[PDB]
């Protein structure tokens, strides 16, 4: 179980998870604020 | 015939002589190292220039060096 | 009497012929 | 070369549309017999003439192929 | 010796075919020949220069003779806009009858070639009118070729060969080359323009048999000495003038107008005469700087040694560079090639925007051909300028004699130079390719309004500062009361503002997002080619992976597979890699130029402005769209005069691809194959009665790289030339 | 697992039944895309009241030669 | 000081079927090589040119076309088998030349009757720059 926690922190798995989460975040941002060319706030 | 030179940083490990495929190199007695040994290159008219000796030397930088020079029949490795 | 009718052939056919036999005989000659 | 030969030959002399009267119109006009024998006919009548579909797919549902064409060249 | 080649004894004792190959490719590297001195090297180079001069004169002799003999000039002078100039005749016995009919144009009586060098416009502009002028010139060039050869011979015997320290007198040579070679020549050219060509474009035919009896100005040489030069510009050609006629002709010989000639869309002749006179004056005065036999002037070495900033930020400054430059020929050659390359692409950029020749701006194919020719030659010259820097660093550089000056300091922080070049080129590549791909995706999904289209507001501002009024910036020369527009309004500003604000010339074309993106691609190319060449130069004396590289020469295959492997580690190999990037960069540049101009010549500028912002646009609307006529040059239904280009197009595609072989396959495979073949031959009957004299061997490693690269770039040039000429000549518009 | 995916996509995101009704007019399609950044343009009119990506693996032909007539079997 | 052996012809050769990898014209006009060894018994071994041969019990004498062939065969014979070998270079004149091992000992073992050839007494980082040897035919490593 500890060995599993180590394995999950090996480079390919760590990067896979990091980028899947990042992808979900950017996807949802663009689903909420679509077609942005400028910063329309201030 | 290529040129092969031995420099005084040699530690006399003999790894270069074991590697030569044409028997160019040789060990000779010395007094400048713990092994009392040094490499020499008495038969450079048979050297094909493979640098198999340089891949084997452990010193930094190298103690055996191969300078490619004028080509002959033996140097090119021609069987015809 | 047509001028290219003579120069195009010999510069195209015989000049390289003589020059190639020339340079072959020269380059394979041991002095 | 094998797949280019098969693709041009099938369109030129096999595939096409037939009419009720029974006159077969092939996808390409049947130009394999006379244009395949030179290299210029392969460059002109096969590559240049049939790449039109993929270089005109931007804006349609075939635009993914137009993107992959260029990505694969890259 | 006792064999070819004589200069190398090591190659002459080579019993394989290598001996021949390398014999040819080492013939002009004089420093590597057996028993070479300093005097022999210098004298060889001097005679070689003379040989090259003879070559150039014989080539231009050939062009003149051939258009005077098989040419079209006389009919072309009568109507420059409605006749195609002939280059020479075709005699080819493999021709069939339809091709014979197809190539017979321009009014000739048989198959011919149309010229695209632009020599009819140039010779017409400077004065030559009938075939006897061209014959005259050709004979004179033959004479000068022979004289060049004679001098080359004369300066190789004893009794006439100069010493090494004659060749090392730098102040002398610079005085003479500045005031003599550049100033006197420009003065005599101003003379030819004032005496022959300015009259030639006003109806009169001044020649050798009458020129001592024709005034160039109404009051010859009066004004010059009384001081009032202004009288020479008192009556210019009116702006309704017809070039080779008297209708609308003036009398001025020197002016400063700025605009173009209205009829020919070309520079005024009086402007060019006045320009050459002005710069000849500048050169003559400036050629009196350095010191010689007369006890005044400057010592270059003293100027170099006195330029060291206190505070020691440049170390020992320039102390000792006179002898580093004076003693190294590769240093001097690198400098020469760098300066010449920059001014070659300056020639390219100025000859299309400010055409000098009459009726050349209306011949589109010659414009495109000249631009591409000069840009590609400039790129090659740049790669050579950088290669001889690495050769200099290996061969002639002396560390102890340059201790702590600017050069050794360059060597001392090579990591900081390479790292920042690397950062710059990474940044440009990432963002340029990223924006292009963004735009392509946006248009594949049908949303061209979602594009990222940055506007080049700085180049638009600089164009406003020159007097363009398309972006409403109202800055210098585009404002109303600024001293810049105020101080020049009388002399050149009328003509300049009239030309720059016209939109059918190429003087400061309008720009938009597409221009921005392609300019950043050009910047990426320049930065990456510089990175490769600079790294190759600064690492040629040794690096960490091979600290003794200087003991191996400029070019060598590798250091074997030890230490991880050392393929392509010489500085020659950095040059070889950089040639690819040079070709790619000049490709981007010339593609940009040709697409912009071909859409402008068709009145369809919006086509470029809309399709240039995504790469599918370039592929479909430029490459694919403009290829139809070329590839239809011959087809199952016949051939037309584009046939020769349709053929050449394919030649270039073939040669190029053959270059891939030598570049992807390497030596061992081929050597084993050849051993097999040698067995086969020696064993077969009636054919083993024949014996080769050199043992056949595969090519060398460096040799294979060179041969591959040569095929690659030959294919490159040939395919692009065929397409460019056929797609402009087919539309002729 | 790859076969499982093919059959599930034929069963769930496909126009196989309508194609079964009129094979020479409906062009087969067993992949649809989400509307995220305008990419829904890739969901093209493949006929039969359906919008997606036309497939070329020839799976409908196999499923018809097999006797499969409902999505429950897939 | 170690007289070298003589070449004893009439020494038999291994049992081979022939192959297209053997001698060629270079052995007729330029040179070829000859290796000899001991072979306690008859055994099979891989020819350094083609397939497999059978070495005979007693002395063995092979003719090859390159020094590298002889030395690769000798390395195989000396490590995988425990066999002593010597090889020679024969000219078209009919002149032999004992080649290896030169002074009776194998070169990876230091023998007290050897001189130094090609030894520089300094590190490799202390060679002069090429500018120091320009126009004179030496090389920077020559020293
Ligand atoms: C470098 C300049 C140059 C070039 C590129 C050409 C090119 C050409 N010439 Mg031309 N020629 C030239 C100079 C040149 N010529 C000069 C100065 C003269 C005398 C005024 C002639 C007289 C001439 C005639 C009479 C004919 C040609 C013909 C031809 C064409 C057929 C090919 C041929 O037969 O070769 C050229 C054949 C010759 C006899 C030329 C001989 C004279 C030159 C000076 C030879 C130079 C060789 C030199 C030793 C090597 C220089 C090194 C470098 C060029 C590689 C060809 C396009 C033929 C043609 O019109 O085809 C339709 C034709 O019959 N030429
Ligand atoms: C289309 C072909 C191509 C491309 C794209 C490149 C690209 C590059 N070359 Mg190169 N080169 C090429 C052909 C090419 N070369 C050829 C034929 C030769 C002759 C052998 C050379 C020889 C050469 C040399 C000698 C050098 C370069 C250098 C460079 C780098 C320059 C820096 C830069 O522009 O930043 C980046 C630009 C890019 C275009 C990178 C594009 C890739 C992006 C990052 C894709 C992103 C991945 C994405 C997330 C999806 C990944 C998919 C997944 C499955 C992994 C760059 C990566 C120089 C260098 O290293 O600079 C430091 C250098 O020294 N090239
Ligand atoms: C250097 C290259 C580059 C650049 C500068 C851009 C820039 C942009 N792209 Mg693009 N793209 C690129 C490459 C690039 N792209 C490539 C190579 C592709 C092909 C894979 C695409 C495909 C693509 C698509 C399909 C789309 C974009 C879109 C966009 C816009 C998104 C704005 C946004 O996300 O809202 C705002 C996002 C944020 C504010 C994130 C920051 C918030 C953080 C996480 C929180 C921090 C709080 C403290 C933006 C201007 C979208 C668009 O709308 O186009 C107009 C979109 O539809 N791009
Ligand atoms: C006034 C005296 C004088 C003059 C006129 C020259 C002239 C020349 N010398 Mg010399 N020299 C001199 C004194 C002089 N030298 C002295 C005193 C010394 C001893 C210190 C030397 C030592 C010396 C050496 C060692 C060498 C020369 C060389 C040369 C030649 C250079 C190559 C060349 O022709 O390119 C032509 C250059 C120009 C025409 C000017 C440059 C033009 C620029 C780059 C651009 C032109 C712009 C314009 C748009 C072009 C129009 C294009 C259109 C027509 C198509 C040249 C003819 C070289 C040589 O002789 O080769 C055999 C060389 O090796 N000189
Ligand atoms: C190196 C170029 C060059 C050369 C060789 C010539 C040569 C000649 N020019 Mg001339 N000219 C030139 C450039 C040149 N020009 C330029 C650039 C201009 C424009 C300013 C003129 C404008 C010009 C005019 C207006 C006239 C000539 C005339 C002449 C002829 C007589 C000169 C004379 O005796 O005056 C006298 C010489 C001197 C008083 C000594 C000159 C002092 C120098 C610097 C020493 C002569 C053949 C005259 C002529 O009648 O032609 C037949 C004539 O009137 N030229
Ligand atoms: C005034 C310009 C100039 C001069 C005087 C020199 C002079 C010299 N260069 Mg240099 N160089 C230059 C410009 C110049 N270069 C440029 C512009 C480049 C960039 C391309 C280079 C790049 C360069 C490199 C990388 C090297 C030199 C080398 C040398 C030295 C020996 C060259 C030699 O004889 O090898 C022999 C000459 C050849 C092998 C040329 C034959 C092969 C060519 C490339 C094929 C031509 C293409 C084809 C035939 C034409 C098309 C085919 C047809 C279908 C149309 C020599 C001192 C070499 C050297 O020895 O180091 C000092 C060296 O390695 N140069
Ligand atoms: C278009 C590029 C190109 C071309 C033309 C070739 C051509 C060839 N390859 Mg190669 N190859 C290439 C790309 C190319 N390759 C690339 C990119 C790679 C890297 C993977 C390889 C890797 C490779 C390998 C590993 C091998 C070959 C082999 C061969 C040879 C095959 C034998 C043969 O067919 O003889 C016939 C020759 C031709 C078909 C060429 C065209 C013939 C022309 C049209 C005849 C014209 C003659 C003309 C009149 C000459 C006179 C002109 C005068 C001015 C002198 C052949 C010469 C194989 C080989 O050597 O076989 C023994 C070999 O094993 N190639
Ligand atoms: C090689 C087989 C294969 C392939 C290439 C695909 C490909 C695809 N499937 Mg699919 N699928 C498959 C097998 C396959 N599937 C199998 C065997 C089943 C079950 C029988 C399904 C059930 C299924 C469903 C229900 C859906 C898809 C969807 C999709 C599309 C969106 C991808 C996605 O999952 O959303 C995004 C990707 C993720 C959220 C990450 C996936 C992580 C999950 C938890 C499983 C992976 C965890 C792993 C074991 C560790 C995509 C084109 C979706 C679709 O068509 O949208 C319209 C959709 O809803 N598939
Ligand atoms: C219009 C004619 C074009 C040629 C003009 C150039 C010649 C004028 C300058 C030459 C200086 C000679 C220097 C001494 C050089 C000299 O004469 O030394 C004689 C030479 C002996 O060589 P060396 O022992 O002197 O070698 C020392 C070298 O380092 C000197 O380069 O013997 C030969 O002649 C070999 C002949 C091979 C010929 C190969 C054929 C090459 C074909 C092309 C040759 C040029 C033609 C170009 C046309 C495209
Ligand atoms: C490696 C090496 C080498 C080589 C180098 C090179 C090749 C360099 C280059 C470079 C380059 C290629 C450069 C360029 C440049 C440029 C510049 C520097 C410029 C400028 C200018 C200006 C500043 C301008 C101004 C103006 C005017 C006048 C008016 C109008 C406006 C303006 C502003 C535009 C040598 C041999 C030396 C040495 C060894 C090492
Ligand atoms: S390069 Fe090869 S043949 Fe030459 S001495 Fe070294 S190991 Fe022996
Ligand atoms: S490998 Fe290097 S250190 Fe060892 S004996 Fe050979 S030369 Fe000396
Ligand atoms: Ca304008």
GROMACS .gro file of N, CA, C and O in nm, chain G residues 56-80:
model
  100
 1090UNK      N    1   4.199  -3.061  -3.714
 1090UNK     CA    2   4.255  -3.194  -3.696
 1090UNK      C    3   4.335  -3.202  -3.567
 1090UNK      O    4   4.390  -3.103  -3.519
 1091UNK      N    5   4.344  -3.323  -3.513
 1091UNK     CA    6   4.428  -3.348  -3.397
 1091UNK      C    7   4.574  -3.334  -3.438
 1091UNK      O    8   4.620  -3.400  -3.531
 1092UNK      N    9   4.647  -3.246  -3.369
 1092UNK     CA   10   4.781  -3.212  -3.408
 1092UNK      C   11   4.788  -3.075  -3.472
 1092UNK      O   12   4.691  -3.000  -3.472
 1093UNK      N   13   4.903  -3.041  -3.529
 1093UNK     CA   14   4.922  -2.905  -3.582
 1093UNK      C   15   4.823  -2.872  -3.692
 1093UNK      O   16   4.781  -2.959  -3.769
 1094UNK      N   17   4.786  -2.744  -3.699
 1094UNK     CA   18   4.691  -2.693  -3.797
 1094UNK      C   19   4.746  -2.568  -3.862
 1094UNK      O   20   4.808  -2.484  -3.794
 1095UNK      N   21   4.720  -2.553  -3.992
 1095UNK     CA   22   4.780  -2.447  -4.074
 1095UNK      C   23   4.673  -2.394  -4.170
 1095UNK      O   24   4.632  -2.464  -4.262
 1096UNK      N   25   4.632  -2.269  -4.149
 1096UNK     CA   26   4.527  -2.203  -4.225
 1096UNK      C   27   4.585  -2.083  -4.298
 1096UNK      O   28   4.670  -2.012  -4.244
 1097UNK      N   29   4.539  -2.058  -4.421
 1097UNK     CA   30   4.582  -1.941  -4.496
 1097UNK      C   31   4.465  -1.845  -4.513
 1097UNK      O   32   4.362  -1.881  -4.571
 1098UNK      N   33   4.482  -1.723  -4.464
 1098UNK     CA   34   4.381  -1.618  -4.468
 1098UNK      C   35   4.436  -1.496  -4.541
 1098UNK      O   36   4.551  -1.493  -4.583
 1099UNK      N   37   4.353  -1.393  -4.554
 1099UNK     CA   38   4.386  -1.279  -4.638
 1099UNK      C   39   4.404  -1.149  -4.562
 1099UNK      O   40   4.431  -1.046  -4.625
 1100UNK      N   41   4.391  -1.148  -4.430
 1100UNK     CA   42   4.404  -1.025  -4.354
 1100UNK      C   43   4.458  -1.057  -4.216
 1100UNK      O   44   4.436  -1.166  -4.163
 1101UNK      N   45   4.530  -0.961  -4.157
 1101UNK     CA   46   4.579  -0.981  -4.022
 1101UNK      C   47   4.464  -0.987  -3.922
 1101UNK      O   48   4.470  -1.062  -3.824
 1102UNK      N   49   4.359  -0.909  -3.946
 1102UNK     CA   50   4.246  -0.908  -3.855
 1102UNK      C   51   4.175  -1.042  -3.852
 1102UNK      O   52   4.125  -1.084  -3.748
 1103UNK      N   53   4.169  -1.111  -3.966
 1103UNK     CA   54   4.110  -1.245  -3.968
 1103UNK      C   55   4.188  -1.339  -3.878
 1103UNK      O   56   4.130  -1.409  -3.794
 1104UNK      N   57   4.320  -1.343  -3.896
 1104UNK     CA   58   4.405  -1.426  -3.813
 1104UNK      C   59   4.388  -1.393  -3.666
 1104UNK      O   60   4.378  -1.482  -3.582
 1105UNK      N   61   4.382  -1.264  -3.633
 1105UNK     CA   62   4.376  -1.227  -3.492
 1105UNK      C   63   4.240  -1.257  -3.430
 1105UNK      O   64   4.233  -1.297  -3.314
 1106UNK      N   65   4.131  -1.240  -3.506
 1106UNK     CA   66   4.001  -1.280  -3.454
 1106UNK      C   67   3.994  -1.430  -3.432
 1106UNK      O   68   3.945  -1.477  -3.328
 1107UNK      N   69   4.044  -1.508  -3.529
 1107UNK     CA   70   4.048  -1.652  -3.511
 1107UNK      C   71   4.134  -1.691  -3.391
 1107UNK      O   72   4.097  -1.779  -3.313
 1108UNK      N   73   4.247  -1.623  -3.372
 1108UNK     CA   74   4.333  -1.655  -3.260
 1108UNK      C   75   4.270  -1.620  -3.127
 1108UNK      O   76   4.288  -1.693  -3.029
 1109UNK      N   77   4.197  -1.509  -3.120
 1109UNK     CA   78   4.128  -1.474  -2.997
 1109UNK      C   79   4.022  -1.578  -2.963
 1109UNK      O   80   4.012  -1.623  -2.848
 1110UNK      N   81   3.944  -1.620  -3.063
 1110UNK     CA   82   3.847  -1.726  -3.042
 1110UNK      C   83   3.915  -1.855  -2.995
 1110UNK      O   84   3.868  -1.921  -2.903
 1111UNK      N   85   4.028  -1.889  -3.057
 1111UNK     CA   86   4.098  -2.013  -3.022
 1111UNK      C   87   4.157  -2.007  -2.883
 1111UNK      O   88   4.162  -2.108  -2.813
 1112UNK      N   89   4.202  -1.889  -2.841
 1112UNK     CA   90   4.275  -1.877  -2.716
 1112UNK      C   91   4.181  -1.867  -2.597
 1112UNK      O   92   4.215  -1.916  -2.489
 1113UNK      N   93   4.064  -1.805  -2.613
 1113UNK     CA   94   3.979  -1.798  -2.494
 1113UNK      C   95   3.882  -1.915  -2.484
 1113UNK      O   96   3.878  -1.983  -2.381
 1114UNK      N   97   3.803  -1.941  -2.589
 1114UNK     CA   98   3.703  -2.047  -2.580
 1114UNK      C   99   3.768  -2.184  -2.572
 1114UNK      O  100   3.722  -2.271  -2.496
   0.00000   0.00000   0.00000
